[PDB]
Amino acid sequence: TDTTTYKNLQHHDYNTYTFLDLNLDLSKFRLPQPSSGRESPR
Amino acid sequence: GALFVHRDTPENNPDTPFDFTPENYKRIEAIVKNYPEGHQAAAVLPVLDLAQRQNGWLPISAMNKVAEVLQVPPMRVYEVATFYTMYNRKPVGKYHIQVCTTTPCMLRDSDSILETLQRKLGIKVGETTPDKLFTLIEVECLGACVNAPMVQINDNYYEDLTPKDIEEIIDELKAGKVPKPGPRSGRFCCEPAGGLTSLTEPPKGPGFGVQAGL
Amino acid sequence: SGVNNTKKWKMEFDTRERWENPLMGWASTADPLSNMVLTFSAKEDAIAFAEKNGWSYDVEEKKVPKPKSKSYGANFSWNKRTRVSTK
Amino acid sequence: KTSFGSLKDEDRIFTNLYGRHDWRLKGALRRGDWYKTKEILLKGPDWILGEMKTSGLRGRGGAGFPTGLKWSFMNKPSDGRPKYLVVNADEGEPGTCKDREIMRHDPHKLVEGCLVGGRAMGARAAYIYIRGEFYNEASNLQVAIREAYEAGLIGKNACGSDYDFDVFVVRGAGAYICGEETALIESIEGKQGKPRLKPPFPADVGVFGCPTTVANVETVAVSPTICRRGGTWFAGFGRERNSGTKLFNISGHVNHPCTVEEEMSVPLKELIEKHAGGVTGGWDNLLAVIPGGSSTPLIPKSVCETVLMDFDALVQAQTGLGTAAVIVMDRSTDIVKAIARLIEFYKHESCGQCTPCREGVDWMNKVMARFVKGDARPAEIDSLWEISKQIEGHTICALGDGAAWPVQGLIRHFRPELEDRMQRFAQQHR
Amino acid sequence: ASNLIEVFVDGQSVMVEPGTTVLQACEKVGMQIPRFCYHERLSVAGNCRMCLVEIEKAPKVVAACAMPVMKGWNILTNSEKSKKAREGVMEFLLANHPLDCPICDQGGECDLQDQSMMFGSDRSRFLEGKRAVEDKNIGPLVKTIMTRCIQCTRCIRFASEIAGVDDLGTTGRGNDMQVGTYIEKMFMSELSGNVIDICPVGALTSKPYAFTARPWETRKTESIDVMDAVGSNIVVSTRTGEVMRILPRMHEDINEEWISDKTR
């Protein structure tokens, strides 16, 4: 119930790969993607 | 300032060595899996940004490598890399200082911040220090306007800046230590200075004010 | 892209010899009906004029451009190949 | 009610606006997020859309369009294509930091709102397009999303409601035009940030050609609190048709520039004198206010005396409520220089696709620079007004309108200042 | 009237199929709405904004090249809002367009000049300096003077959709948006002189035809191409008894609007 202290200090120790490492960690939790029926629109 | 054409140079020709690290290829695979099948062209921006984060700047070989990986046209990759302003098509320093110079930062005197930065680094805007440690440019609004004036150094925001504060940040960067982000004026975030006008009470907690029938 | 010159029928003549003037290099001609172009409101009117003046004619039917189905949303198709890659 | 303002802390939605509590899942659950969200999802799409409609929430993006109708545009049977919620988290507009603050301080509100809106419209995923410069905010958002996935609030059983929903975060790469709806859709699809024409509307053909809905972070984040506490409460706040609370970012020449949450229809003088600490030098030292970010025109002190903070009130004041970004300028402000800096911003941020915004905004930037120098004659004021009228309403997207409106406000109010600058330049050269 | 909707152009009724755009309805009635980026065989771009027209009882002008008619719309093609919109868009194009008309191969063949004379104003209010763009070197067939380019993306859409090469595009942003290739690339496929055809300005001109003649000089002879067995209908432009140019002819069943590079 503390209120006089800033509590976003976790953003200080972020490196340049933090976002993509989190995304790679998140990749296992996701549903399979839909398919458009072709490999590419060419 | 910049030119949206490519001239082959010995440092930026399409034979300069760029390739992703294997862990970066794993990250690229996750990025591609974030999108529906047949729409892997949606991963152009994150893969190009990953190339920039690995390499520093973005050479034409890096753009061609991103195009070759994603099987998209290299002209489409060039269109993205030239449209978006966060892509470095030329090498920058170790620290890329971006000083916001839009209207509320100008009201809170970003010009003094810019002039003291030019005096401290010995360079003009848009150019690099000769030791390749600092590039200094002006930018538009960075989305922190109540904390004006502010700069962005790489991925960090340094806010509520005075000339003494920005000189201290430059001293820490030259010394090689992190200057820590956030405001330098003694307030933690966007809160009002000299006390809080709101949110003084503790939050009410779960199940407060819930409508009946839910 | 303007189409205002495709509204009226024209009758022209077969092209004859244009040679080089020895003195000056100009385009000398010998037929008088080289610049003769006649404008008609209708194909049958041009037919009547040609038959009246006793000239053999070749008639080309009017090439009206075909109607085309245009959809701006086809540029952003989910599955079809009409999805564009740039704008 | 007749007078509006003085919003209570127990009625404020963003209870962790200042980052004084834990922004992670434990702190969010202590503050009351993710409460009965399974019951909300089992109540289902039509009930949530009815709750938004009876709340009368309007778009916090700056468009001002009703949220209930806009989200009910996707309340259709599926034609085999997937459906998507897309969250505008770019926050490009000057003067505005509210989306940044709530993304880095209440991210679980944004995640729960993504789930609620995606269930209401029928959606398998929400793509949060965040601003490219907000790297730490995006990483905090990904931490919150990983916490939600681990707790089972997101993904293949949405809080145990037999609903599958995924939340992706996609970063931009520095374009203010990518905060636009269709340009954001194109940027997610991987092309340049160029807006596409309407029709087709994004509820029919949007991201990946699928039906989609682009909604602001503030709108999405206040959606689950609206569902929990009812639309009658949120409609009871604010005036008629301008209902609820609002995040105001007061910046410029004020003593305490800050982001605050206040009720709709609060007087502008009351908001500044209560939360910003007043104008630097005082209310008499106040000169002009841009009330809705850079896209809205300016209003002078005389109409700033009694104006309210409603969409309708600012429309009557010949302005708009944009992102509720109140930029304050005092008597020492070079007002022509400030407006010219805004036009230079729009010149640097135009996507360049369509001719009126491209050529005309560059033209207006050059004319405004000469106006700052005084290097013009007063006929060019009416010429610039006509150029702004040619830009406005003739463009693909509303960046042309948002560049024409500040020029129109400056010409409408501070025209003798421009004429005085031209006269002083003329007499000092000739 | 099954699967047809009745719309009005200047109060005149016309039955059109659903999905017909405003421009197509107006050309069915018989009037040609001004355009720069719309081409009947390219995809809809909608960026030049020359086709802005007024719909009755509607406050905002719509882009006729992209907006489909709904039902009972009265399209006011010659109303004051439409005329003002055309004048404004023409002013915006000619503000940065370079004063190159005597030295430009699009002399009497200029859509920009003709639509300026028919729909724009007669004078300029632009008192500033113009932009200038360095030229590109996409090949010895197409000569690029990209200062004249109005960023209409016709060449980009053609090379993407018909030539199928995906080599052209726009690099940059805002007033600095430039059409071309980012790298020094030679754009050489077959069917590559049709960008010289469909570029409305003289930004993409023909290098063999450079500075040779003018369209009012050139006599037009409608003939057939024999360089292959397709039999593409062409126009031979001859001046003073000398073949000056080969252009295509519109034949929907053979070659549509284009000819091969060898033919051209």
Ligand SMILES: Cc1cc2nc3c(=O)[nH]c(=O)nc-3n(C[C@H](O)[C@H](O)[C@H](O)COP(=O)(O)O)c2cc1C
């Ligand atoms: C040039 C331009 C830039 C915009 N930038 C943003 C932005 O950064 N963030 C945002 O939420 N909306 C932005 N908008 C407004 C969007 O249209 C709006 O957010 C979107 O329609 C979501 O609708 P909503 O207001 O109902 O939530 C921008 C609009 C324009 C024309």
Ligand code: SF4
């Ligand atoms: S108004 Fe400007 S930013 Fe919007 S589509 Fe047109 S060129 Fe792009």
Ligand code: SF4
């Ligand atoms: S393209 Fe047309 S308007 Fe431009 S210089 Fe050539 S003839 Fe003149």
Ligand code: SF4
């Ligand atoms: S070069 Fe010509 S066809 Fe291509 S965008 Fe420019 S004006 Fe259009």
Ligand code: FES
């Ligand atoms: S205007 Fe400088 S951060 Fe927004």
Ligand code: FES
């Ligand atoms: S012809 Fe419609 S905008 Fe160009």
Ligand SMILES: [K+]
């Ligand atoms: K041409």
